[PDB]
Symmetry: D2
Subunit: 289 residues, 4 copies
């Protein structure tokens, strides 16, 4: 079963970014030339995933709904569900249980930006996996802040620890995950962690203890950025800016990926571009077709 | 009469930043570690202006309201009014006619960021002017995009042109203006320009024609940035970031300015800083007191 | 024959960066934490090319020499030759005629920075080509500034134009080229272009006309930057900085690449890293081993 | 006696920037669009100082000499003297003793960038002081790395400590200093510090113990940047870039300051611009006149 459903966890508190995130959701913040949520959404789209459930806070869910709509304009089927309280990323599978049904589902954090040659290829391997789960390991400078994966001599993943005091490696689990349908039952039975939250890491550990976790390496050639701090938020923006300025191509443009993957055709693009042709984004879409 | 009233024009369509401004108000977009509106707000605070009316769109006006409230926490008196449609910047004085009354009133654009040694001294001079109006002239690289002020050989402001195809100089009129009570009567009788908008420049031309306009020069030693383009918004953030990182001091932090100007006491600061201590912002205010 | 020889063209007038290039060679300018030449040098190292000739101006050639020496510390064999005057990039093969001999030879511009997942795999394919030549096509925002490659409806490279007034496409030819021995004979018989310079593009057109040119596409997933302008040089540095900061890994560090490719052992690394431990650079290599 | 002599200490080791500073002096590195040394030189020029002694290493002194010449082109009188070994900034007065004679002299570190409205004014006060010394205090985030100044209740400087473990404040002494002629005798008798170097800080302490030190406050409105680390070097570049891009005015352009201060007239500017008009710097100079 190809993973055809996905979830974007665009809620949270964003205390690290106050007061910036006091009146503006972290996932609505701009990462250079477009709202942050366009990045994780693009990643799902590039995986061939069109049916997406967007989860956010009670106050912000309607805003992402106003920004994205039902997604038909990009040939997508977007749905929205509120997460009452930020009680853990794993809760996404409890909230989106109905949305998932008996199918497989991907989950990507709303503030995660993925960029790199052959990124679609790497995900497709996970999209096609008949069962189990697929997570990605990425070398970072401060692994303690993330879910760290320990590898043995042969280079095989053996354990996972959420924000360990002493990381057993510098490889963090990224915020993009692909699960089979058994994820829902795991989430429903998960107990609050040591930090009072239902962590996705605990789900990844269950898949691993059952020998069903594939820890796909995401090399240094790829870019995996986070936007939880003032510093990182601006670093990611400069990053994307350098790339787009040089290439004359936008990174993660929903309209462009929709067109290139045939979710919509040229006429639709032209119709969308027209009313926006007055600005650069519109001109970008027109040049594309 | 010392100017004690100010108006922050925080609306507009903001079509140039599309799509970042599709889900979040431009004046709420972050400039490194704080909402864009904190900057022009700080400018008025530094000018001694505490009674401030915030005008935004019908959709966003309530958002600024939820973010800032009546402003009493910073020893300010904030009021809010909606601008049905972006009919023009000069329309701010018609909308705020009741708020202004018979008093003098300053106007600052919600996306204007001012910074430089003696800035307070600069505004102070314009704030104490008995009558007339005061605008500032800043040397910019792209004059065509703003109100341009031409000078005669003696170096005296002789004319003002809104977005001239052939700028008569590289000095633009910034978005910080100090007017006397007569400004209300002018805006009320203003006729829409060729572009169907009530131009603030027209107001300024009227003051000039009446020999009541002081065009204060704002030297290159000062920094004046607006966020018209994605590229400019990110440079604005890098600018503020380098400064703050280096000095270990924040730029345009309302809580700090309210405190250093004795608008509020150390106890009020500690209370407002409590929820914001998850990051440097709140810890900063704590150390400040 | 596996391409084992490479030439790094590190000269030129560099008049566009004036005055930064008035006292220091452009290829010695820093890109965040290391000299610009370390990047193209790393590209050749990653392509398996260890015998490298560095061509620069009569003034700078000796400077690269003092910086890198014979390159044996990185398990390389570096040679140096002077380019009297910047008569053209294709002149590299006349100057390096003795160095090349009867072998194949790669050419990379001293100011070219390549980065991306599978980059080594990309070059590997061109390095193992029996005969012919291999260049790469990259989508850029300003094609007019480089050799442009046009494609027919079937998507096949049909022509090459040096700095066309009317680019036939947005794909530029990067400064990394893989040629067979016949390149020497071509450059020797090349006549200066309209701008009085021996164009590398002419060489490439000759390979195309002989049906021996492979135009490999270099996707948007890859990053290709040159330092033609002050603005580009700084974006290049921010790009590398964000990446290194995030991964806790360095981009194009010769010592590291020489080590991971077994060009040198851990003992050689420790020795070269000793003097460089006053900053992250040397400490990095230490932790690496 | 108006301070009419100055010294630029453009030597040092720059170990923190290896290998960037292995073949390129730190003061030759680019700070966006021009070599680092243009900044401290500009500061001296803005102080009305034309007779300047440039001190550097034995290998780099001739390079600054090749970049600047005798300075007659900018209406200056530049001299050069080598500092055999980086034995301390205070040694600058031993090396330049002959250059100083019986006159007053300013000293600015070669990697110090000063920017801010009314910066010339602040220096002129020090330039006119009949005797004693003038140093500047600046609020920084990491004072331990600099010479820290302690102030009492009234806000009067009382002590100075070079790189104290526990700074008595967050105010660092900048790298710009103005001394009367007694500085030479102090330097000749200075004993190596606790770190085996003749520190300028010890000279500042002697002036203070004699009640002849003026610690001029340099507020947050000013920008004082250092370029000793990879991070700071790029932060300063982005800073200057944002300013120049917005204003269309260059920060610290020797040719421009020379013209504006009448060291040279328009004809000279035109003659200098002509041969450089092909690049942006030349066009900048032409637009200026
Ligand atoms: C936990 C948790 C996170 N998030 C999503 C939001 C984020 O994009 C992503 C990770 O952000 P996180 O930074 O780990 O949580 P946060 O957004 O509240 O930031 P802070 O720690 O400063 O308070 O996960 C939720 O939507 N719901 C949750 O219950
Ligand atoms: C290995 C290695 C690669 N590179 C750069 C070259 C390429 O542009 C980019 C990616 O090439 P690759 O390394 O092969 O891509 P990767 O994602 O597989 O990296 P890894 O599995 O080792 O984490 O990394 C270096 O600069 N230094 C190195 O030591
Ligand atoms: C016109 C107009 C502008 N603005 C404020 C919004 C901005 O902060 C400030 C800047 O002037 P403008 O730049 O013209 O504001 P804008 O958003 O209309 O420009 P654009 O759509 O091209 O991006 O003026 C209003 O609030 N109301 C108005 O009627
Ligand atoms: C004039 C002039 C100033 N400066 C920098 C030095 C100071 O840090 C900063 C401000 O000092 P001043 O220039 O004298 O202050 P200003 O902003 O009033 O100058 P102006 O009226 O010409 O706009 O400008 C230059 O770099 N080049 C110049 O040609
Ligand atoms: C032409 C020519 C270029 N170059 C190398 C230098 C650069 O790294 C690379 C880039 O191509 P160019 O950009 O044309 O090099 P350039 O320095 O002549 O360009 P400009 O003066 O406008 O800044 O080519 C030479 O070494 N020798 C040459 O004869
Ligand atoms: C195509 C396409 C890719 N991507 C980003 C996603 C990946 O991180 C990165 C590279 O994945 P891929 O695009 O599939 O690798 P590529 O460089 O070969 O693509 P192309 O041949 O079209 O140049 O590009 C977009 O954001 N938008 C797009 O329209
Ligand atoms: C000490 C000392 C510094 N310097 C000048 C060079 C610098 O611009 C300035 C301060 O730089 P410093 O950073 O304090 O010394 P440095 O340039 O050797 O850098 P590092 O500590 O990483 O080795 O003083 C000298 O020229 N001679 C000296 O004897
Ligand atoms: C004080 C104070 C100033 N400012 C900004 C406003 C001005 O653009 C800039 C400089 O105004 P001024 O503060 O008066 O300039 P200054 O160099 O004298 O600062 P100080 O003596 O306090 O160190 O600082 C703030 O943002 N917050 C503050 O709390």
């Amino acid at each position: 079963m190809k993973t055809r459903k996905g979830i974007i966890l665009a809620g949270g508190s964003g205390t690290r970014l106050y007061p910036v995130t006091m009146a503006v959701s972290q996932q609505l913040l701009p990462i250079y030339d477009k709202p942050m949520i366009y990045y994780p959404l693009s990643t799902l789209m590039l995986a061939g995933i069109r049916d997406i459930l967007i989860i956010s806070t009670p106050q912000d869910t309607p805003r992402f709904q106003q920004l994205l709509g039902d997604g038909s304009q990009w040939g997508l089927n977007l749905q929205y569900k509120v997460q009452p309280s930020p009680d853990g990323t794993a809760q996404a599978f409890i909230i989106g249980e109905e949305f998932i049904g008996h199918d497989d589902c991907a989950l990507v954090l709303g503030d995660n930006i993925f960029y790199g040659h052959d990124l679609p290829k790497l995900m497709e391997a996970a999209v096609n996996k008949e069962s189990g789960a697929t997570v990605f390991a990425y070398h970072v400078n401060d692994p303690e802040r993330y879910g760290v994966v320990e590898f043995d001599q042969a280079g095989t993943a053996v354990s996972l620890e959420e924000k360990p005091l002493q990381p057993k490696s510098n490889y963090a689990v990224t915020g993009l995950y692909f699960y089979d349908n058994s994820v829902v039952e795991m989430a429903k039975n998960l107990k609050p962690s040591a930090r009072g939250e239902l962590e996705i890491t605990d789900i990844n550990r269950i898949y691993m203890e059952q020998g069903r976790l594939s820890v796909a390496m995401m090399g240094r050639g790829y870019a995996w950025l986070d936007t939880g701090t003032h510093q990182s938020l601006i670093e990611a923006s400069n990053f994307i800016a350098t790339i787009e300025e040089r290439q004359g191509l936008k990174v993660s443009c929903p309209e462009e990926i929709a067109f290139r993957k045939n979710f919509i055709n040229a006429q639709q693009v032209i119709e969308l571009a027209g009313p926006l042709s007055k600005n650069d984004y519109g001109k970008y879409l027109l040049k594309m077709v």
